[PDB]
Amino acid sequence: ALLSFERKYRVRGGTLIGGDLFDFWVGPYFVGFFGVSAIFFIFLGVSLIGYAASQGPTWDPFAISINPPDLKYGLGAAPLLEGGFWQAITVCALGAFISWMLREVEISRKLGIGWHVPLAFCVPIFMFCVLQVFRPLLLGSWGHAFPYGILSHLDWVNNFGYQYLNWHYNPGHMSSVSFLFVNAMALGLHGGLILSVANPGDGDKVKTAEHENQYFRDVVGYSIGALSIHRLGLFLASNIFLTGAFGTIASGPFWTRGWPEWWGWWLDIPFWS
Amino acid sequence: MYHGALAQHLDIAQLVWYAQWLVIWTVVLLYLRREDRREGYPLVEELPYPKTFVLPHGGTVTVPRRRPETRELKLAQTDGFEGAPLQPTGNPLVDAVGPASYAERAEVVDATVDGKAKIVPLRVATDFSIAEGDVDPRGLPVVAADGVEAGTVTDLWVDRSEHYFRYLELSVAGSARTALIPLGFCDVKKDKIVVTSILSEQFANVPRLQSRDQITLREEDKVSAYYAGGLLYATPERAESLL
Amino acid sequence: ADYQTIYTQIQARGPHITVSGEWGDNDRVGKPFYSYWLGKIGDAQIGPIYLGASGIAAFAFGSTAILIILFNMAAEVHFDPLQFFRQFFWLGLYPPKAQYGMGIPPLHDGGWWLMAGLFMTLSLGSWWIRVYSRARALGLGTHIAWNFAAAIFFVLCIGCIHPTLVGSWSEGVPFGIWPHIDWLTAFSIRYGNFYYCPWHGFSIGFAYGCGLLFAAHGATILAVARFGGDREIEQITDRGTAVERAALFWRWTIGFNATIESVHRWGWFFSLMVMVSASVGILLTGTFVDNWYLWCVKHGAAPDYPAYLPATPDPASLPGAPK
Amino acid sequence: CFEPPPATTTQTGFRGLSMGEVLHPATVKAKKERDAQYPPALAAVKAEGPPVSQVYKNVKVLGNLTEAEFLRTMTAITEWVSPQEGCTYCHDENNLASEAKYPYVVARRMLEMTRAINTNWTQHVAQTGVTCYTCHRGTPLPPYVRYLEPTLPLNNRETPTHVERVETRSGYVVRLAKYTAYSALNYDPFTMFLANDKRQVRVVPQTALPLVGVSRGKERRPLSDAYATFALMMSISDSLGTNCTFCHNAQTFESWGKKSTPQRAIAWWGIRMVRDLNMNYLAPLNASLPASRLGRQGEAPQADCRTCHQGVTKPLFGASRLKDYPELGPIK
Ligand code: BCL
Ligand code: BCL
Ligand code: BCL
Ligand SMILES: C/C=C1/c2cc3[nH]c4c(c3C)C(=O)[C@H](C(=O)OC)c4c3nc(cc4[nH]c(cc(n2)[C@@H]1C)c(C(C)=O)c4C)[C@@H](C)[C@@H]3CCC(=O)OC/C=C(\C)CCC[C@H](C)CCC[C@H](C)CCCC(C)C
Ligand SMILES: CC(C)=CCC/C(C)=C/CC/C(C)=C/CC/C(C)=C/CC/C(C)=C/CC/C(C)=C/CC/C(C)=C/CC1=C(C)C(=O)c2ccccc2C1=O
Ligand code: HEC
Ligand code: HEC
Ligand code: HEC
Ligand SMILES: CC(C)=CCC/C(C)=C/C=C\C(C)=C\C=C\C(C)=C\C=C/C=C(C)/C=C/C=C(\C)CC/C=C(\C)CCCC(C)C
Ligand SMILES: [Fe+2]
């Protein structure tokens, strides 16, 4: 049930709220007050998806879709089968996300480590709010949000991008895309480096941290460092949504044309026009 | 006629879809998930055959480790439930339980690539120094969590393999000893080193080194774990609820 | 709070280390210098750098490709320095616009494009030798080289392999900021919406997956930097409490965990699968699939929606409609 | 750089597909005011009398009207075409039956073209229709015309800069860009798609698998056709002041039915109408117009979407003069 080095860490404490009341384990999982509330919102959310899906025309996983209301309903309540189910599932999703994050804070405190992981988990929760709450609020209706469906929510992303002619020219998009590329590149570089030092091949000796910095000083002339690549990788990954949140919330509230035309601030400067 | 069409209503891109799922789950479940089990297994209270590393400075190791000795835990179970938390039976900082726990690392000195001791104080690493513009902590007071001066910084321990300071050494006030503290537990100001992990009196029981001018891998674990245990155990309130 | 995870409070200086390789120690060039502000979030030493034959061949082949691109771009503005600096994002080198099949297109309609791509292919191959040989010279595994080769392979797929499989140099990627962007939409339109290519979704999941992994892994090592978690090579061969607490964080959160070594195998595998998935999708595109959306419609996977505005017949299908 | 909130948004597809218009009220307001300059209908006149085919000397199209009904149209045409030059823009002041001025012979062909649009192209103009004003907007040269090469600015009433001039070769890319909604697509979708009926706008297959005989080598259309279609669609979107979801469900651009809006079908008739107007009415006019009206290849000014729409999904937001001037169509 326990790892070979787990028992000495299985002490009480580190909780935010609840005290000893929920400070226990269920198998390998830790519970806490936020593990209870997480199961609460997940059960409530999965239930709502099931009841709404039974009312639909298909049980095919790729075809099921739970969509937001019509634009005319605005930010008010919507009929259960005409957007209400979407509204309740969204509330449950946020509850499960925020509970999952605070649960991670409690596990961090019991282990005596920093809160770096739950703080980083706030980034994808923040972007989810930009799409489903913040941008809908600025535009005036919940129907501007994406639907909950495996293949249907891709059509949302597709139409939304074309609503502004060529979404590729979105400057917040170009930044979000650049971080997505460089982060996946840096993870292959870094994961490959550590494995190259510990697995030199044949029956050779495991190399050193000196070998790490020497390889990348040879290839590119600079090595950022063992600890610094972990601060960098978290910075590159987080800025996929941090910079992308700008371009998404500007499409509509702050810009209604096609994104190629936005670049007229440069192209249309009078002295070289 | 169509390119890629096969028998029945089948086509080539359809076949590769099944092949792609098979390869992905084969790599995930039959390889990556078994490499995840090279530490902490087997469980107590599917496994890969052992992996053996040839160490850079002589000798080998095979993971996971089987230590010739094991420690006795000063912990008391809170209840008979299989997933009940444990409870310290004494001083958790010196007993090293919970966040104060350290691992049974090798009692060997971590070495540079050319065989020298990696973590050494600047009194030994005379070719090293602090960069121009940063605070030289030597001679500055160490202020603990209760606001009391715990001692005075005497040296910095540098990693000669990465050119990175990792500890401060301070004379413990009224104890005729020096203790090491990881720089992560130090808030370096211009006139003081702030340490909120433990109180001033708790600096007396920081694990001591066997040699004055070097440190082993297990001693580094013991020193780091003691301050981390203070995040939960320095005062009775840190083990309770925040709200 | 661990302030070291934010920046280096006290930077250390020392004699610069040189680890000898099997060959090429004499080909390292440059006097190292130290940036104070770079040292706060990384190592302060910049340089030296290794040259070598493959690294030199990469610069020669690569500068040739770039020079061919920039010259053709300067001609598009008739060698006006102001307009070139202005219109730079819009200028480009294009593949053949007419259909010559696999015949080497004229210089004014795709010839310069095919030649810059040849030199770019030689530049990438040269740089892979350097990435591969530097690991062998230092006694390291080729884990980075083989990840690099998958990215080079995907570039070959959209650059010449798929053009050869369908038999037209017109399907290749143009050189340029906006022009290579515009290719993405024409390539998705032509082949029936890339959102319905399963390997597109596979490559997207792995690309998102590298974002999740480096955020979780990077933050985890920062969280255990108080115990020297960044000293990972020696945490592999001699487990410390840093990666013990790290494994137990994830074991107590998601019910399982990896090792400090294997989490890198996950990260190296996810990054690799971004290119492997994208390549297989380009190789199937056009060769055996003409319309990915209808391909999903053929297999019943496409989602359908009720009519909001009334359905619209194809007017070209109407009786008596013009051609 | 950015446009303030709030924005006008409509819904053109099923909820959750993010289909619909995204408008800026300040832009729509300025266009609504500009299009409100449409002179109201002239008052009704006496319906009894001889036909001008009897009364007058050189009437060839409007011969069935009475004199009062015929001079009314002669006033509206002047209001719509040449209100500042007056009657003598097209007429010899001393003989109104003479064709001695080039605008006379062009205006008669335009009278025929106007009746043709309202009679033969109702699949598009419907009961709204077009008059002289729909394009001319009060000037003899319509503000939004095309030549056989890109030109800037789009509104010919604006003074061009040096680089905007078609003679300056260093600004060609910008002349191409602004006609395709500032994109870098390297194709002129007017001469390619709207000047005549030679090319096929549709480029996406209607088969799941590649059909044998059209899928390899020189059997294939070049992928340049996909860019060019994309270029026409950015020009169409800009000239109407709209986006794709006004017409397509971006799920499947090539599919109709529930994947297309009713406006996409009207747009399809609009493409066939532009080609008819350019090929059979506007292009042959280069033999009647003076050399100062022609393009660098001897071409007369020709029409695209923006000639009538001028940035609005409907010309003049749907304003109509059809019932007020039956002599302009539909023709029984
Ligand atoms: C025609 C369509 C457009 C287009 C339309 C859009 C639109 C529209 C948007 C993007 C956005 C993004 N685009 Mg795109 N995009 C296009 C082309 C591209 C290309 C390319 C090579 O061409 C790339 C690389 C990208 C890439 C990207 C991303 C980097 C970026 C952010 C994604 C995001 O917000 O995820 C969001 C992900 C989340 C919110 C996940 C949150 C997860 C939560 C916290 C946890 C979930 C737990 C789960 C329920 C648990 C289940 C239990 C199981 C046990 C696991 N796009 C084309 C041109 N793109 C966005 C952006 O930022 O734009 C500026 C955006 O809004
Ligand atoms: C603005 C940008 C868009 C966007 C654009 C795209 C595009 C484009 C693609 C995806 C793809 C996917 N997206 Mg999406 N996606 C967005 C936001 C979300 C949200 C959310 C909480 O908002 C979720 C749950 C998802 C989930 C998913 C998966 C179904 C899939 C693979 C992702 C992946 O590997 O991630 C990294 C995470 C992991 C590798 C870990 C495992 C995660 C598992 C797979 C999550 C399963 C979720 C499943 C739907 C069940 C949900 C809960 C049920 C109630 C049980 N996306 C936003 C709205 N997404 C791709 C695909 O194939 O879709 C079918 C694809 O092509
Ligand atoms: C309208 C536009 C289309 C679209 C069109 C395409 C097309 C077309 C392709 C992709 C592909 C990809 N798309 Mg896209 N895509 C869209 C929407 C999305 C969305 C989204 C949320 O909507 C997402 C997340 C993505 C994401 C992705 C990527 C994961 C994927 C792989 C490419 C990549 O990573 O390249 C980043 C990495 C590289 C380019 C590798 C580079 C490696 C080399 C070695 C670097 C050399 C550097 C050197 C200095 C260069 C010197 C040059 C000198 C001249 C010498 N797309 C929409 C639907 N997408 C590909 C794919 O998977 O197809 C199946 C693909 O071919
Ligand atoms: C920029 C930084 C990023 C990043 C980072 C990090 N990511 C983290 C952490 C960090 C740091 C963690 O520590 C945490 C974790 O422990 O990981 C193992 C986590 C996790 N990242 C998940 C998914 C994930 N991350 C994505 C995005 C990024 N992550 C980007 C890249 C995407 C994308 C792109 O789609 C996905 C799918 C889960 C696996 C996990 C949360 C589980 C949860 O919260 O459980 C609690 C909730 C549930 C078990 C389900 C609740 C169901 C609701 C009620 C009903 C369904 C609603 C739903 C909207 C329906 C959708 C339909 C669908 C078709 C639209
Ligand atoms: C039964 C019941 C109701 C119990 C109540 C208690 C309770 C709260 C139970 C939770 C139940 C729930 C919701 C379980 C679902 C948990 C989830 C979301 C599982 C998703 C798993 C997935 C797909 C993760 C994606 C990321 C991924 C592919 C990880 C594989 C590799 C791993 C394990 C990375 C994690 C990992 C990282 C990132 C390190 O850095 C590290 C460093 C040193 C040692 C180990 C590690 C390590 O394991
Ligand atoms: C822009 C074009 C235009 C304008 C403005 C214009 N004319 Fe006309 N006019 C024509 C054309 C063309 C015809 C021949 C139409 C036909 O054959 O039915 C014509 C025919 C006539 C005739 C018939 C004479 C004959 O015997 O053939 C009269 C009278 C006339 N116009 C009067 C007027 C008046 C009155 C005005 C202004 C108040 C005016 N014109 C301004 C173009 C114009
Ligand atoms: C007002 C009308 C309208 C607008 C706006 C519009 N479309 Fe089109 N589009 C059409 C019509 C009609 C066709 C069919 C052309 C034909 O039948 O000859 C078409 C054709 C297409 C095609 C090719 C269809 C095929 O079978 O090959 C694509 C792709 C496309 N449009 C995408 C777009 C894009 C991209 C945009 C904007 C950026 C856009 N549409 C905006 C009306 C429109
Ligand atoms: C010479 C006249 C003319 C030209 C050229 C023209 N339009 Fe139209 N169009 C009209 C008129 C008039 C209407 C008003 C029809 C109505 O009220 O329903 C209209 C209506 C439309 C509509 C319907 C909008 C709605 O809200 O119902 C679309 C879509 C459209 N045009 C697209 C196009 C396209 C596509 C082209 C060219 C390729 C084009 N227009 C060029 C005259 C024109
Ligand atoms: C000043 C400094 C430091 C750097 C300058 C960089 C610079 C300004 C470059 C100039 C303009 C820019 C930014 C251009 C950007 C171009 C981009 C983004 C291109 C992106 C993709 C292009 C691709 C993938 C092209 C691939 C082409 C190929 C793989 C061709 C393969 C060719 C062959 C196999 C030839 C064999 C056939 C034989 C019979 C001829
Ligand atoms: Fe790492």
Numbering used by the authors:
A (entry chain B): 1 to 273
B (entry chain D): 1 to 45, 61 to 258
C (entry chain C): 1 to 323
D (entry chain A): 1 to 332
Manuscript text:
Here, we explore an alternative to the perfect Gaussian distribution for serial crystallography data using data recorded at the LCLS (Linac Coherent Light Source, Stanford University, California) from microcrystals of the Blastochloris viridis (B. viridis) photosynthetic reaction center (RCvir) as a representative example. The phenomenon is illustrated by re-analyzing data collected from microcrystals of the Blastochloris viridis photosynthetic reaction center and comparing these intensity observations with conventional synchrotron data. Here it is observed that serial femtosecond crystallography (SFX) Bragg reflections do not follow a unimodal Gaussian distribution and it is recommended that an idealized assumption of single Gaussian peak profiles be relaxed to incorporate apparent asymmetries when processing SFX data.
While the typical intensity observation is strongly influenced by diffuse scattering, the highest ones are more likely to originate from good crystals. Thus, we can aim to determine the diffraction intensity of an ‘idealized’ crystal in its ideal diffraction condition. The highest-intensity observation of any given unique reflection may or may not originate from this group of ideal crystals at the top of their rocking curve, but we can define a region of the intensity probability distribution where we expect the ideal crystal reflections to appear even in the absence of an actual observation. As a first step, we have developed a Bayesian model to infer the probability distribution of the parameters of the empirical ex-Gaussian distribution from the intensity observations of each Bragg reflection using a minimally informative prior knowledge (assuming a uniform distribution). For each Bragg reflection we determined the maximum a posteriori values of model parameters (μexg, σexg, τexg) as a starting point and calculated 50 000 Monte Carlo samples [Metropolis stepping], the first 40 000 of which we discarded. Subsequent modeling steps and map calculations were performed in the Phenix suite using identical protocols (see §2). After molecular replacement by Phaser the final log-likelihood gain was higher when using the Ideal Crystal data.
